[PDB]
Structure 1
């Protein structure tokens, strides 16, 4: 299992513009197009991202291309962030994926705000971090996903993604 497989499970794959859990226009593997309610705006964003007139639909290869760019951006966001980098460097490879998963979903800024959980992760207090992470809007709005991620941080194994 790796970060790509993990996010593919959490985000799924859709080749036509759809709305994410928050009601935002998205496509491919969780690639947010815009927070604007305008489908037209979303369509334009899509064409700009892909480099052709898509009319709202893309190929699997295109979805995969966007996906690689998105994972790259998440990782780079972590590496550039002063609060994130030290935690990320302190974690084993599996747990690191859980952190990348969060950034992909909520953005660098969003995750950097989880101050207390970040400190607990850096201290390797797994059970305590898990409880703290669960006291969030994040956990309450997307509980199944949050549970998989939190379990990953808690155990350092891929168990939560096994049998999916």
Structure 2
């Protein structure tokens, strides 16, 4: 098991532009294209990504390509996140699994959502730090996609993959 797997399990895999839960323009295994309105916007977005006039269609490879980047990036966010908000040593003290969920939770957060968390994080404390996490996954996925939200916090709160297993 792993973060990849885990996200493929949580995100699902779509090759045709759709709206997510929040009604955004998304694609693949999470690829948020755009928050707008007009598809076009999102389509165009897709186009520069891919670079080939997809017209809302992609391929497994294509998708897999976006994915990896998305992941490496969440993985990167996470660090910076607790980089700030102080509590860096927490980032370091972490283990695989916790940290995987962390990556999950924060993927594919986007500056605005990112910002807040950091706040809610600092303003929390070295020991409290944890609940903002659980807190953020809740809300992001609660109401709408609660199994996911459950799957995460657990994994996060347990350091065990059994949940996704």
TM-score range normalised by the length of the shorter chain: 0.7 to 0.9
Please, what TM-score do these two structures have when normalized by structure 2?
A: 0.78
CA contact under 8 A between 1:14 and 1:27: conserved in structure 2? yes
- Larger helix percent: 1
Give 1:107's aligned residue.
Answer: 110
| Cα contact 1:19–1:26 (8 A) shared by 2 | yes
| 2:57 aligned counterpart, secondary structure | coil
Shift of 1:123: 5.4
- Alignment match, 2:160: 157
On the 8 A contact 1:87/1:121 being kept in 2, the answer is: no
- Cα displacement (A) at 1:37: 1.0
Partners of 1:38 and 1:9 lie apart in 2 by 29
2:22 aligns to what? 22
Contact 2:85 2:122 in 1 (8 A): no
Contact 1:94–1:156 (Cα < 8 Å) also in 2: yes
TM (norm. structure 1) is: 0.79
Structure 1 residue 83, shift from structure 2 partner: 4.9
1:22 to partner: Cα distance: 0.5
- SS of 2:15's equivalent? strand
Between the aligned partners of 1:67 and 1:131, the Cα distance in structure 2 is 24
| Cα shift at 1:106 | 2.6
Moved more, 7-16 or 84-93: 84-93
Gaps of at least 5 residues in structure 2 are: none
Contact kept in structure 2, 1:17 and 1:27, CA below 8 Å: yes
- Number of residue pairs aligned between Structure 1 and Structure 2: 162
> CA, structure 1 residues 65+133, in 2 after alignment: closer, same or farther (shift >3 Å)?
closer
Using the alignment, how far apart are the partners of 1:21 and 1:84 within structure 2? Answer: 32
